[PDB]
């Protein structure tokens, strides 16, 4: 029997660190595709 | 065959019951007798 409260298991990531890291990744990816280009991420689009 | 129902939670329409309360039969040490036991399963462990 489940005792106490019922909630949804969750994850947290610190926003400033995450955004800065994604900025660094963008900076380093722009070298392999030319300086002036646009990069946009998007969540997974299917599968198991 | 698990005869199973929903946990008596205060769920909404969208927030599906993530715990299913399922009862079924099992064979004890004495091979002649069969007992009825209940348990809880997550929604991704039961197919109709």
């Amino acid at each position, epitope marked *: 029997d489940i*005792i106490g409260d*019922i*909630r949804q298991a969750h994850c947290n990531v610190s926003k400033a660190t995450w955004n800065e890291t994604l900025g660094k990744v963008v900076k380093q990816l722009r070298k392999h595709f030319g300086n002036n280009t646009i990069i946009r991420f998007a969540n997974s689009s299917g599968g198991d | 065959t698990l005869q199973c129902t929903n946990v008596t939670n*205060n769920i909404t329409d969208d927030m599906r019951g993530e715990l299913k309360n399922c009862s079924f039969n099992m064979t004890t040490e004495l091979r002649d007798k069969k007992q009825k036991v209940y348990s809880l399963f997550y929604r991704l462990d039961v197919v109709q």
Partner: antibody
Amino acid sequence: QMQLQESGPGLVKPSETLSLTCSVSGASISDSYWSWIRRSPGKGLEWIGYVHKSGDTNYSPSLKSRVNLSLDTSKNQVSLSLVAATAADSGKYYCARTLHGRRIYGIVAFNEWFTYFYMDVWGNGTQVTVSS
Amino acid sequence: QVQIDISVAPGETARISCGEKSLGSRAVQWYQHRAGQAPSLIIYNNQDRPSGIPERFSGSPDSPFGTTATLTITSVEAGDEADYYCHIWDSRVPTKWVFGGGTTLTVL
């Protein structure tokens, strides 16, 4: 500092509406929620329903189609109306003031909370006796 | 519901119970009813109380488990004779529209 004046004849023939009006004197109708309570012998007093600020009232599941509520802004009062009354709904009626409640136990972004309503100011009550 | 008769000796505390303990986070309500006078609340949250009413009364905080909502009447007074009703807000098990089983407190 609001005094709720319950006006009701208290007598209605069977299979007819039992209408009572709780007039508002001390305050304005749009200050907090209005709820209604019915006390009858044999059971404790019952919280029969309430009225939202936007007129989106809620009723008990037992008598959702038997009783109705209305709110009027021209006259500072609330109105309650039973439909097809029988001899078992007689007793005492109270119009009461109710405050919004918001206690959080999970994560707001994922819902996980409940809206509880309670009582802080009651009326002096009215007695209704329905019989042939 | 049932008007169970419970009496408390003056000068000693009393403990009143509300049945059907739930199994989650709760928001308790506790109202009184004294004949011939206007009923009013006593407890609106487990550890939060309305102004005006003297400090003598208190309610059980259900933050740990196994702590049923028990109404504690400390320093009882001859004017405390009334009917005490419970309206339980409960998380897992659904909304309780009807108030819980009441109690009748009389002063001996």
